[PDB]
């Protein structure tokens with residue numbers, strides 16, 4: 001839904017590349033998020049001490065968390081927009097426990113795109129970028145709707 005089936009197939013085709021190396025993509029994505037938008041580490045007390053990209057790359061905790069994040073995102077993307085049941089617990093924790101504003105979800109979406117462009121430049125063209133961007137945008141829109149239901153000013 002929202003995306004055409006053909007657009008979803010571009011998304012899942014790019015996502016298969018992510019699934020070939022989930023921990024590597026998750027490390028890169030979190031490091032890119034924290035390096036570009038260091039204010040986002042205010043949400044991760046446990047990672048505030050990491051002093052360099054090298055230390056971040058060597059952190060097993062950070063790696064495991066990237067796996068957690070991308071595993072959850074892959075399950076969402078594979079539902080192709082019919083992701084109500086996967087999004088419910090995620091919106092709950094991120095609105096009420098972690099308190100993640102929508103703008104931080106935009107930042108991590110931009111980091112996902114950047115990392116895919118860095119890791120797959122010869123197999124991540126304009127249509128694949130546009131489709132992944134639409135899919136992440138839909139994810140954010142539906143999170144925002146749940147945020148509102150929950151009373152959280154995202």
Ligand code: HEM
Nearest residue numbers: 040043044068069072073089090093094098100104105108
């Ligand atoms: C693609 C977007 C995201 C996905 C799919 C995702 C997914 C997850 C999942 C599955 C968990 C573990 C279970 C839970 O608490 O719900 C988690 C934990 C958490 N997430 Fe997210 N997340 C995303 C974005 C973010 C962003 C952008 C931030 C902060 C800027 C953030 C902050 C946190 C924190 C603080 C935790 C707890 C970490 C800990 O255990 O120490 N999340 N996330």
